Design a protein around this ligand. Structure first.
Ligand SMILES: *C(=N)C1(NC(=O)[C@@H]2C[C@@H](S(=O)(=O)c3ccc(OCC(F)(F)F)cc3C(F)(F)F)CN2C(=O)C2(C)CC2)CC1
Length: 219
C-alpha cells in the first residue's frame, strides 16, 4: 500500500527553490532537482547541483538540449551519465545565459548511472514512483496565464491540455480540501505560486500532461 500523502521536503530531500530568469533552463532545474533527491537518499547530504553545467555542456545534437532555448530532463541525465558527473551549484553557479562548458571532474558532486521513464499518462505509476523512489522529473502544460495567477488550493484550469511545454519536479502528493494534488517544485523563485510550489490536480485524467513524460535518475 502507498501513503495517502507524501512530501519529500519533510525528509530533507529538496533543495531551495531556484530562479531561472530569462533563460529557458526549466529542464535543467527539473533534472538536477530529481538528482538532488537521489543524492540525499543515498549519501545523506542535501546539495544543490549545477543547472548551469547542464545548460553549458549538453547544448549539442548528441543530447538535443538547447541551453537557454530549452531541453529534456532525460537528456540531461544522459549527459551526466556520459560525462561521469555533474558539479555542485556552489562551484558551477547559475548565470542564466549560454556559456562555454567548463566542467571540472575534480569538482564532481554527483553521478548518474541510468534513468527510469514511467508509462505514458499513468498517474498511478507516478504516485508509486513519488512514494517509493523520490522526486520525479515531469513535463507539464504551463502555458496558461492562470498558472501564474495561482496562490493556493489546487490548480485545475479546464483550458490546460496534454501538450507539455515546461519541465518541473514532483516532490509529493496528497489531497487538499477533497481535491487530489501533485506537489510541484518550479524554478521561478519563491515569489511564484506558494513559496515556489504549485499543487496541481491529480487523478483528473492526466491534467496538464503531468504524467505524460515522467523520469527519474539512479545514482
Ligand atoms: C523551460 N524553461 C522551457 N521548456 C523546455 O525546456 C521544455 C521541457 C521539455 S517538455 O517537458 O516540454 C517536453 C516536450 C516534448 C516531449 O516529447 C514529445 C514527443 F517526443 F513525444 F514528441 C517531452 C517533454 C519532456 F519529456 F517532458 F521533457 C522540452 N522543452 C522544450 O522547450 C523543448 C526543447 C521544445 C521542446 C523552455 C521553456
Amino acid at each position: 500500500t502507498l501513503p495517502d500523502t507524501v512530501d519529500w521536503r519533510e525528509k530533507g530531500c529538496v533543495t531551495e527553490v531556484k530562479y531561472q530568469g530569462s533563460c529557458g533552463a526549466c529542464w535543467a532545474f527539473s533534472a538536477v532537482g530529481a538528482l538532488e533527491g537521489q543524492l540525499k537518499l543515498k549519501t545523506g547530504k542535501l546539495i544543490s547541483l549545477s543547472a548551469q553545467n547542464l545548460v553549458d555542456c549538453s547544448n549539442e545534437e548528441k543530447y538535443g538540449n538547447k541551453g537557454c532555448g530549452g531541453g529534456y530532463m532525460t537528456e540531461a541525465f544522459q549527459y551526466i551519465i556520459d560525462n561521469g558527473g555533474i558539479e555542485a551549484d556552489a562551484s558551477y553557479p547559475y548565470k542564466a545565459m549560454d556559456e562555454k562548458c567548463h566542467y571540472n571532474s575534480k569538482n564532481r558532486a554527483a553521478t548518474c548511472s541510468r534513468y527510469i521513464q514511467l508509462p505514458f499518462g499513468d498517474e498511478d505509476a507516478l504516485k508509486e514512483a513519488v512514494a517509493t523512489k523520490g522526486p520525479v522529473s515531469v513535463g507539464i502544460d504551463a502555458s496558461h496565464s492562470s498558472f501564474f495567477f495561482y496562490k493556493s488550493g489546487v490548480y485545475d484550469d479546464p483550458s490546460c491540455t496534454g501538450n507539455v511545454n515546461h519541465g518541473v519536479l514532483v516532490v509529493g502528493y496528497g489531497t487538499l480540501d477533497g481535491k487530489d494534488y501533485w506537489l510541484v517544485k518550479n524554478s521561478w523563485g519563491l515569489n511564484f505560486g506558494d513559496q515556489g510550489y504549485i499543487r496541481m490536480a491529480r487523478n483528473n485524467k492526466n491534467h496538464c500532461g503531468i504524467a505524460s513524460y515522467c523520469s527519474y535518475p539512479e545514482i
